[PDB]
């Protein structure tokens, strides 16, 4: 084995693994984005500077050349993973921004949500919003399907919403959360979308051309939210067999995507856990928390 | 609910006046709720000042709490309840960075086992 992570000055909110499994990216309240070597001695490669707000969410593009960073300063930055130079920051959004997801296997697209209640589609080449989906309720988490046709948004209305890029309509509503949704994520297959919520329910939803119209495919339990009201994010394993979601009770929860048994409950976080990530090749977990430390658990 | 700020009043009156309020063992907690801090970003100085007294397990600022304008509300977890009592005893009604400071016990937040140890230690002290 276990490697501890030190260096962060404030809460870590998100961390990701580079698509090729050679490096990690992490950021939080301290506005710095740190890069780490996955192997060797787990060294710190560089520091991305330029966010004035806190970093709420990181993502890599599928190639691992571009790193996207939603900040509370209303700007979404695009970063060069190789040099650490800033490329472009999204402009248009109002108030705090909760999340941003970059479309894969298609021409470059970025989706964002913020406290202004809107969801925006960005073409990184235009320096302007492409579409806007005005939502009265503040939006917390947003992701694309694999076809880059649909936008999936989770807010404080307890209802995951699916948007059609061509029709620009509310295509789908999912009921089944009793409280705010704080974190969304697609399976690598496109088949299933994973959600965390203030109702202490982790629920998998299946999105398909042909569906059952009551896609509460599975429900998991263990994951606790509390007074801190931290955004909570969840991740799929590279093969879709394991589900990890962070909690506020200091434990990393990992479940079996089928039987729903808790595979791991991992103590070692003094405070609340904000994001859990899986290494893309090997059974390694990066757990990021508010205690400013990261762990590299191996399964 | 119980966080309301009661008001003061011969009875051989002391130097400082006291509001009418009896403290039971259950009322007292090791969670200390502080309200009235000026909103000038003194998160860390307040916590250091309180850590002078005991040892602080956890501190966070709870923003959901209904507060007045430009004013903050905080939570402090102590390690030993006697330390919490002395922290209240001395910190309450102390001018802090230009504001009156109001500390109250926060028993709602403590969990069942924490209540178990609170009550048991009260019994331990009272027996001796």
């Amino acid at each position: 084995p276990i490697m501890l992570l030190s260096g962060h000055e404030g809460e870590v909110y998100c961390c990701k693994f580079h698509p090729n499994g050679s490096t990690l990216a992490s950021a939080g309240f301290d506005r710095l984005i740190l890069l780490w070597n996955v192997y060797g001695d787990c060294d710190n490669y560089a520091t991305l500077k330029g966010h004035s707000g806190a970093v709420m969410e990181l993502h890599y593009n599928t190639d691992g050349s571009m790193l996207f960073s939603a900040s509370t300063d209303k700007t979404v930055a695009v970063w060069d993973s190789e040099t650490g130079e800033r490329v472009k920051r999204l402009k248009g959004h109002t108030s705090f921004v909760n999340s941003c997801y970059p479309a894969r296997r298609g021409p470059q697209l970025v989706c964002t949500g913020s406290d202004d209640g809107t969801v925006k589609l960005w073409d990184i080449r235009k320096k302007a919003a492409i579409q806007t989906f005005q939502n009265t309720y503040q939006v917390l988490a947003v992701t694309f399907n694999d076809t880059s046709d649909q936008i999936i948004s989770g807010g404080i209305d307890n209802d995951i919403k699916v948007w059609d890029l061509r029709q620009n309509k509310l295509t789908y509503t999912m009921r089944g959360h009793a409280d705010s949704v704080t974190g969304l994520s697609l399976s690598s297959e496109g088949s299933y979308l994973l959600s965390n919520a203030m109702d202490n329910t982790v629920r998998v939803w299946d999105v398909r051309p042909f569906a059952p119209k009551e896609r509460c495919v599975k429900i998991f339990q263990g994951n606790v939210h509390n007074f801190e009201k931290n955004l909570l994010r969840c991740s799929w394993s590279p093969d879709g067999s394991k589900i990890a979601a962070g909690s506020a009770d200091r434990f990393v929860y990992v479940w079996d995507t089928t039987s729903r048994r808790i595979l791991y409950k991992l103590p070692g976080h003094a405070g609340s856990i904000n994001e859990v990530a899986f290494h893309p090749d090997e059974p390694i977990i990066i757990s990021a928390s508010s205690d400013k430390r990261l762990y590299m658990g191996e399964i | 609910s119980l966080f309301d700020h009661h008001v003061q009043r011969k009875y051989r009156e002391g130097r400082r006046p006291r509001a009418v309020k009896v403290y039971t063992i259950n009322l007292e907690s090791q969670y200390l709720l502080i309200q009235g801090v000026p909103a000038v970003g003194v998160m860390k100085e307040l916590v250091e000042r309180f850590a002078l007294y005991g040892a602080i397990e956890q501190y966070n600022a709870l923003d959901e709490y209904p507060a007045e304008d430009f004013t903050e509300v905080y939570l402090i977890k102590f390690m030993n309840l006697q330390s919490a009592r002395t922290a209240k005893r001395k910190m309450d009604e102390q001018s802090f960075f230009g504001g009156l400071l109001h500390v109250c016990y926060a028993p709602e937040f403590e969990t069942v086992e924490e209540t178990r140890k609170k009550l048991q230690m009260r019994k331990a002290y009272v027996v001796k």
């Binding site: 000055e9 806190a54 406290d115 009201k229 | 600022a61 923003d63």
Partner: peptide, 30 residues
């Protein structure tokens, strides 16, 4: 409905409080 609006307002208040500029890391006094 109405409780959704009140919850949204409360969340907006919480975000406008906890992530205020005055709490930003590296806050120079000057």
């Amino acid at each position: 409905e109405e409780k959704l609006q009140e919850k949204a307002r409360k969340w907006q208040q919480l975000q406008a409080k906890r992530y205020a500029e005055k709490r930003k890391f590296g806050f120079v006094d000057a």
